[PDB]
Design an enzyme around this catalytic site. Structure first.
Site, PDB file in Angstrom:
ATOM      1  N   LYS B  50      -5.291  11.948 -11.075  1.00 42.62           N
ATOM      2  CA  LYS B  50      -4.020  12.638 -11.291  1.00 42.62           C
ATOM      3  C   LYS B  50      -4.017  13.533 -12.527  1.00 42.62           C
ATOM      4  O   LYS B  50      -3.112  14.339 -12.688  1.00 42.62           O
ATOM      5  CB  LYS B  50      -2.873  11.632 -11.402  1.00 42.62           C
ATOM      6  N   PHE B  91     -16.413   9.474 -18.920  1.00 42.58           N
ATOM      7  CA  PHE B  91     -17.505   8.872 -19.658  1.00 42.58           C
ATOM      8  C   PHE B  91     -17.347   7.339 -19.602  1.00 42.58           C
ATOM      9  O   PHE B  91     -18.233   6.629 -19.119  1.00 42.58           O
ATOM     10  CB  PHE B  91     -17.461   9.445 -21.091  1.00 42.58           C
ATOM     11  N   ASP B  96     -17.873   1.850 -17.227  1.00 41.22           N
ATOM     12  CA  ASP B  96     -17.003   0.680 -16.975  1.00 41.22           C
ATOM     13  C   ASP B  96     -17.187   0.166 -15.550  1.00 41.22           C
ATOM     14  O   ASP B  96     -17.188  -1.045 -15.327  1.00 41.22           O
ATOM     15  CB  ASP B  96     -15.530   1.070 -17.250  1.00 41.22           C
ATOM     16  N   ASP B 100     -18.444  -3.564 -14.705  1.00 41.73           N
ATOM     17  CA  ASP B 100     -17.455  -4.384 -13.992  1.00 41.73           C
ATOM     18  C   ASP B 100     -17.858  -4.607 -12.537  1.00 41.73           C
ATOM     19  O   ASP B 100     -17.108  -5.218 -11.772  1.00 41.73           O
ATOM     20  CB  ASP B 100     -16.070  -3.720 -14.013  1.00 41.73           C
ATOM     21  N   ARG B 105     -13.423   3.940  -6.796  1.00 35.68           N
ATOM     22  CA  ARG B 105     -12.616   4.532  -7.843  1.00 35.68           C
ATOM     23  C   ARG B 105     -12.118   5.843  -7.259  1.00 35.68           C
ATOM     24  O   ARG B 105     -12.895   6.630  -6.727  1.00 35.68           O
ATOM     25  CB  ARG B 105     -13.486   4.775  -9.082  1.00 35.68           C
ATOM     26  N   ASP B 167     -13.233  -6.981 -24.136  1.00 40.54           N
ATOM     27  CA  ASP B 167     -13.053  -7.172 -22.707  1.00 40.54           C
ATOM     28  C   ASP B 167     -14.239  -7.953 -22.133  1.00 40.54           C
ATOM     29  O   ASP B 167     -14.060  -8.933 -21.412  1.00 40.54           O
ATOM     30  CB  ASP B 167     -12.923  -5.806 -22.020  1.00 40.54           C
ATOM     31  N   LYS B 193      -9.028  -1.058 -25.792  1.00 44.58           N
ATOM     32  CA  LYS B 193      -9.692  -0.497 -24.630  1.00 44.58           C
ATOM     33  C   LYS B 193      -8.906   0.523 -23.814  1.00 44.58           C
ATOM     34  O   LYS B 193      -9.497   1.262 -23.029  1.00 44.58           O
ATOM     35  CB  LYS B 193     -10.166  -1.614 -23.688  1.00 44.58           C
ATOM     36  N   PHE B 232       0.987  -0.087 -19.839  1.00 44.39           N
ATOM     37  CA  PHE B 232       0.147   0.488 -18.807  1.00 44.39           C
ATOM     38  C   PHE B 232      -1.016  -0.411 -18.370  1.00 44.39           C
ATOM     39  O   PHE B 232      -1.245  -0.573 -17.175  1.00 44.39           O
ATOM     40  CB  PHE B 232      -0.375   1.850 -19.258  1.00 44.39           C
ATOM     41  N   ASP B 236      -1.844  -1.983 -14.798  1.00 42.55           N
ATOM     42  CA  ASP B 236      -3.180  -1.817 -14.200  1.00 42.55           C
ATOM     43  C   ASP B 236      -3.732  -3.186 -13.782  1.00 42.55           C
ATOM     44  O   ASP B 236      -4.346  -3.329 -12.720  1.00 42.55           O
ATOM     45  CB  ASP B 236      -4.155  -1.167 -15.197  1.00 42.55           C
ATOM     46  N   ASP B 237      -3.529  -4.184 -14.635  1.00 41.98           N
ATOM     47  CA  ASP B 237      -3.980  -5.520 -14.322  1.00 41.98           C
ATOM     48  C   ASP B 237      -3.215  -6.028 -13.100  1.00 41.98           C
ATOM     49  O   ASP B 237      -3.808  -6.595 -12.181  1.00 41.98           O
ATOM     50  CB  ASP B 237      -3.752  -6.456 -15.512  1.00 41.98           C
TER      51      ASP B 237
HETATM   52  O1  LIG Z   1      -2.451   8.698 -14.798  1.00 44.37           O
HETATM   53  C1  LIG Z   1      -2.522   7.561 -15.254  1.00 44.37           C
HETATM   54  O2  LIG Z   1      -3.410   6.680 -14.793  1.00 44.37           O
HETATM   55  C2  LIG Z   1      -1.587   7.061 -16.366  1.00 44.37           C
HETATM   56  C3  LIG Z   1      -2.181   7.346 -17.814  1.00 44.37           C
HETATM   57  C4  LIG Z   1      -1.269   8.428 -18.340  1.00 44.37           C
HETATM   58  C5  LIG Z   1      -1.338   9.139 -19.540  1.00 44.37           C
HETATM   59  C6  LIG Z   1      -0.340  10.119 -19.775  1.00 44.37           C
HETATM   60  C7  LIG Z   1       0.702  10.334 -18.842  1.00 44.37           C
HETATM   61  C8  LIG Z   1       0.748   9.598 -17.642  1.00 44.37           C
HETATM   62  C9  LIG Z   1      -0.274   8.657 -17.428  1.00 44.37           C
HETATM   63  N1  LIG Z   1      -0.386   7.874 -16.305  1.00 44.37           N
HETATM   64  C10 LIG Z   1       0.489   7.851 -15.241  1.00 44.37           C
HETATM   65  O3  LIG Z   1       1.469   8.582 -15.133  1.00 44.37           O
HETATM   66  O4  LIG Z   1       0.144   6.908 -14.304  1.00 44.37           O
HETATM   67  C11 LIG Z   1       1.101   6.758 -13.231  1.00 44.37           C
HETATM   68  C12 LIG Z   1       0.461   5.899 -12.144  1.00 44.37           C
HETATM   69  C13 LIG Z   1      -0.064   4.631 -12.451  1.00 44.37           C
HETATM   70  C14 LIG Z   1      -0.676   3.855 -11.452  1.00 44.37           C
HETATM   71  C15 LIG Z   1      -0.749   4.347 -10.129  1.00 44.37           C
HETATM   72  C16 LIG Z   1      -0.205   5.617  -9.808  1.00 44.37           C
HETATM   73  C17 LIG Z   1       0.394   6.394 -10.826  1.00 44.37           C
HETATM   74  O1  LIG Z   2      -9.202  -2.760 -15.723  1.00 42.60           O
HETATM   75  P1  LIG Z   2     -10.236  -1.905 -16.557  1.00 42.60           P
HETATM   76  O2  LIG Z   2      -9.844  -2.043 -18.100  1.00 42.60           O
HETATM   77  O3  LIG Z   2     -11.663  -2.253 -16.250  1.00 42.60           O
HETATM   78  C1  LIG Z   2      -9.746  -0.179 -16.127  1.00 42.60           C
HETATM   79  O4  LIG Z   2      -8.360   0.025 -16.421  1.00 42.60           O
HETATM   80  C2  LIG Z   2     -10.585   0.938 -16.817  1.00 42.60           C
HETATM   81  N1  LIG Z   2     -10.459   0.892 -18.258  1.00 42.60           N
HETATM   82  C3  LIG Z   2     -11.462   0.930 -19.126  1.00 42.60           C
HETATM   83  C4  LIG Z   2     -10.904   0.869 -20.379  1.00 42.60           C
HETATM   84  N2  LIG Z   2      -9.648   0.790 -20.127  1.00 42.60           N
HETATM   85  C5  LIG Z   2      -9.381   0.811 -18.917  1.00 42.60           C
HETATM   86  P2  LIG Z   2     -10.053  -0.020 -14.311  1.00 42.60           P
HETATM   87  O5  LIG Z   2      -9.036  -0.986 -13.547  1.00 42.60           O
HETATM   88  O6  LIG Z   2      -9.590   1.507 -14.083  1.00 42.60           O
HETATM   89  O7  LIG Z   2     -11.482  -0.291 -13.961  1.00 42.60           O
HETATM   90 MG   LIG Z   3     -12.824  -1.473 -14.668  1.00 42.52          MG
HETATM   91 MG   LIG Z   4     -13.410  -2.607 -17.624  1.00 37.05          MG
HETATM   92 MG   LIG Z   5      -8.003  -2.888 -14.181  1.00 43.02          MG
END
Ligand SMILES: O=C(O)[C@H]1Cc2ccccc2N1C(=O)OCc1ccccc1
Ligand SMILES: O=P(O)(O)C(O)(Cn1ccnc1)P(=O)(O)O
Ligand SMILES: [Mg+2]
Ligand SMILES: [Mg+2]
Ligand SMILES: [Mg+2]
Ligand SMILES: O=C(O)[C@H]1Cc2ccccc2N1C(=O)OCc1ccccc1
Ligand SMILES: O=P(O)(O)C(O)(Cn1ccnc1)P(=O)(O)O
Ligand SMILES: [Mg+2]
Ligand SMILES: [Mg+2]
Ligand SMILES: [Mg+2]
Lengths: 343, 343
Positions: B50, B91, B96, B100, B105, B167, B193, B232, B236-237
């Protein structure tokens, strides 16, 4: 021999380096476990070698900067920049050992091969790199050459990385094709993957610190240094198979890794259609027997002798280059290096 | 929504980036094959997401720098710095995904998983990093904020790397021990991280470009941004297991990787000695059945609901933080970010 008179003071400064780097958790207790890991990583991968690359920064520094300007603080920064060169190499070798499936390095087991480390060594290498710039700032942030050192180190990394890319592209796993093992390709690889960071970087770092930032000066130094590097990687390739394991500190993998070695390029040029076929059916394979086959072919073509003949011609050539491009820099700067890598 | 009005111009600038980077072989034909590989690497790993992180540099730039100073050259540098943030992430994610053992991805197969790439992806990641500094120089070398951006990017990498170390230390392979999965450890990990490079980096980059280099200003922005990052990584988790695969673009591996997830930390706090034992015998294992077991336990403890409750409290908290630390910066800078990550 100006190295030996500087080695001890250099190897001792490491404690301060590890101390200054770990002095981060002093305000961020939460990353304590991470700092401990970095220390383990620094002590395992930065220690154990001859330190010639880093020593070259010190030595050249005392030969470039006028004695009056060699205060305690200048020698302090010089030792640090020298350790940065060692860290840069640790960074590349840790990752290189993984991508080359190597087993040992400096007489010990490769970091990634150690139980419990594994692919986590990828991040360990990234930290070693990060440390280069952390030190450069803590010690040289106020110096007029600061930015120059930063750009030099990043430049040197990019070049090395470009060089590792050629190394890996020319040696596709389980994909033997002796056609791409040409001399030109070879010179390009070694030029980027070794010559820049092993010879130019150290001398150039010292030069920038000595205020010598002229483009023409660097280009001239580079003319000599890159040629030295070419010879060095050739020797490294030679030792990979014919070197004394109790001296090299690492097991060879070039033939198995299907690498575009100097030995294979030399073999191809001096091989009959029959031999060529033998090399083709035994190269780039893990089978000990096959690797022993390729070696026998190498010894049959008197490559170990051809190498000894090149080392001499190379030496004369490099010296001729020093007589032409050394000035205005003290010839000793380059002569000290040549003395160490040649016999 | 200021992002959408900038996205197209941003995604198109990539062509120029790939063009300017490949413009290196223009004088060094020998590294042609390497440059071609870099291009393949850039196009596979930098494209497909995105681009919010990089877009944040642009957006914030137009909200910080006065309209009169937003010439064509400033918007050019702004798009580049934004792509640098994307490269920095590429990078880290490439590396990662390897550490992992991830599978996908952005809806596609992880770079290292692609046939023919493998561990060579380690060097591919190193090149992506190198490109950050190559672009910063080709476009911002003459700017007064040059050095600031370089130090910010290196700083952000070091922090992220420190964070990846925590991590990986907290999640030893095949070594289950729920005792170390504490809330404090968790906050530290995510802080380093993720929070630094995903939220602080982008805004800070724009700030430095806007001449805003005050320590107090950055610290205040950081106060808001790091808190956003914490939320955030939590999400993600959460999505790692409860996210819609057709939306996340990546398969979860946290439970199998024995990761110190927000979900596991929350489970432990709200679990009976019986449940605790169930989680202990099914966590950090590849067996699909066991992973399905842990998930069932999570849904039993209403974690998916607990998460929805935290997202709200977090939102209110973050907004309260903006009302206190936004100034003198335009609140919209932070409000635009909050709008995108919250529902
Ligand atoms: O793009 C990203 O991964 C996160 C990281 C980020 C930094 C600055 C501004 C917006 C965002 N995001 C964001 O808006 O994420 C929204 C999102 C999160 C998970 C799934 C779909 C959209
Ligand atoms: O969960 P992770 O921290 O491994 C992850 O968020 C990537 N990442 C790496 C450092 N911070 C975040 P992804 O779920 O995208 O594999
Ligand atoms: Mg990962
Ligand atoms: Mg990781
Ligand atoms: Mg994750
Ligand atoms: O230390 C090294 O690996 C090389 C690299 C280098 C840079 C600057 C000055 C000397 C040297 N070396 C050197 O003197 O190597 C000598 C050598 C080579 C192979 C085996 C044993 C010693
Ligand atoms: O032969 P390589 O180039 O892989 C080597 O010389 C390391 N290296 C990496 C870049 N340049 C040199 P080593 O034999 O030390 O494993
Ligand atoms: Mg190697
Ligand atoms: Mg190698
Ligand atoms: Mg070798």
């Amino acid at each position: 021999d100006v190295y030996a008179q500087e080695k001890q003071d250099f190897v001792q400064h490491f404690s301060q380096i590890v101390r200054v780097l770990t002095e981060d958790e002093m305000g961020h207790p939460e990353i304590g476990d991470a700092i401990a890991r970095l220390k383990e990583v620094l002590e395992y991968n930065a220690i154990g070698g001859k330190y010639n690359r880093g020593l070259t920064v010190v030595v050249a520094f005392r030969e470039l900067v006028e004695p009056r300007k060699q205060d305690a603080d200048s020698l302090q920064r010089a030792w640090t920049v020298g350790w940065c060169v060692e860290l840069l190499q640790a960074f590349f070798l840790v990752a290189d050992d993984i991508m080359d499936s190597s087993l040992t390095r400096r007489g010990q087991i490769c970091w990634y091969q150690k139980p419990g480390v594994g692919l986590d060594a990828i991040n360990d290498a990234n930290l070693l790199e990060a440390c280069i710039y952390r030190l450069l700032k803590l010690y040289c942030r106020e110096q007029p050459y600061y930015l120059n050192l930063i750009e030099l180190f990043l430049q040197s990394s990019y070049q090395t990385e470009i060089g590792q890319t050629l190394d890996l592209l020319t040696a596709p796993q389980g994909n033997v094709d002796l056609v791409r093992f040409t001399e030109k390709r070879y010179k390009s690889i070694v030029k980027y993957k070794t010559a820049f960071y092993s010879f130019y970087l150290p001398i150039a770092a010292a030069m920038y610190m000595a205020g010598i930032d002229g483009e023409k000066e660097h280009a001239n130094a580079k003319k000599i240094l890159l040629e030295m590097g070419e010879f060095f990687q050739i020797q490294d390739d030679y030792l990979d198979l014919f070197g004394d394991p109790s001296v090299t500190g690492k097991i060879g993998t070039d033939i198995q890794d299907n690498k575009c070695s100097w030995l294979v390029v030399q073999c191809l040029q001096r091989a009959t259609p029959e031999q060529y076929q033998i090399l083709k059916e035994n190269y780039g394979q893990k089978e000990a027997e096959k690797v022993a086959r390729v070696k026998a072919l190498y010894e049959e073509l008197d490559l170990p002798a051809v190498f000894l003949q090149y080392e001499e011609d190379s030496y004369s050539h490099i010296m001729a280059l020093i007589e032409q491009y050394a000035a205005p820099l003290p010839p000793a700067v380059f002569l000290g290096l040549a003395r160490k890598i040649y016999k």
